[PDB]
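To assess whether the prediction recovers the assembly geometry, we first specified each molecular entity separately, as shown.
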Amino acid sequence: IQMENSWTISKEYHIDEEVGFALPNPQENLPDFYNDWMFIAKHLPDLIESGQLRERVEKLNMLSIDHLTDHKSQRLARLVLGCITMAYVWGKGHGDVRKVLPRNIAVPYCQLSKKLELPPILVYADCVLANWKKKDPNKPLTYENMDVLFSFRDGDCSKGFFLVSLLVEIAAASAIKVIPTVFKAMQMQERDTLLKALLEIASCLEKALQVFHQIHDHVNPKAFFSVLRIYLSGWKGNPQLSDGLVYEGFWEDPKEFAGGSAGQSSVFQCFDVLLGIQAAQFLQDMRRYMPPAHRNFLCSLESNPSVREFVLSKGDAGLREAYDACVKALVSLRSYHLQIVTKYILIPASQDLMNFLKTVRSTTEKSLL
Ligand SMILES: CCOC(=O)C1=CC[C@](C(=O)OC)(c2cc3ccccc3n2C)N(S(=O)(=O)c2ccc(C)cc2)[C@@H]1C(=O)OC(C)(C)C
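The predicted structure of the complete assembly is given in tokenized form:
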């Protein structure tokens, strides 16, 4: 782990001191040059509902990305074009799919994705980590004080789903700043320092689970399953787009990319790595849907000495308990997630993700010392 100074990790990892892997204070407006993109993105609910979306997209002029001159404007553009792309491909979600993304959006979207080293599909870092604003800049980051920037359909519960996910990410990321202390304490054989750091990590993971509970208040299972999940769906292994999507004017052949998926959150991969919990091929591939600087942090973490090995070599009840408090918090999170998928996907579908989630939960449980 590269350090900015004796206390803080390098700014090159683009991890914020307050919101972690989330984008700090995302841009809400693009340069005037891109007004036509912003109009479509801001009106996706009424444009999809009225069947006007695809014709509006097909009438767009091709706009150069050269006027997106900084990271935040580029991230906002990616979010805008990603949401338009999912709306264009899936339409109203009844099977009337489009297999070709028109060049007037495919080319700038793919060029921008190339510049940020992200796939040209909507990812977690777009629709959660960059898709938010504070209502009152002087009040804290709570659901009541926040909004999303874009939604897909009225009633899709995108605000509830995206913001609760974001607040879970922010709660858990509070422990990232303790990570340099973990490794310093191991190198200096500071038992009490390591114990207290692990307890702080456990506390943050426990808080993150309490925040996730808010999902029930702001997301209804039927709306999530039947509507929102449509626009998070990708074109990898998808029988409706079995060869992928044609990005007109960028590649001649169709290309497959996964939609929103488990494993795209950097902060939970980070504590899986830190605690040695590290299905596996799927999670490795999902790192490539993460911003590249966040991948680099995960990779630097994997190159550090093993916390788990340190705790094992010691034979120290307090360290075992503090380590297990972190693992137990992850077990509780994954058990809760299994119940969420049951309520929000399985039961609605009744009226493979689970075997995957059971495998991860079992791996986590088997890491208890
Ligand atoms: C109602 C369905 O609820 C979920 O299944 C998720 C909700 C949140 C989240 C996430 O980031 O939370 C930290 C996620 C939302 C989201 C949106 C777009 C793209 C990626 C996203 N991800 C990863 N995750 S989660 O990390 O694994 C997680 C889950 C539970 C707990 C207790 C902790 C962590 C999953 C998830 O995969 O959503 C998908 C498949 C993409 C539905």
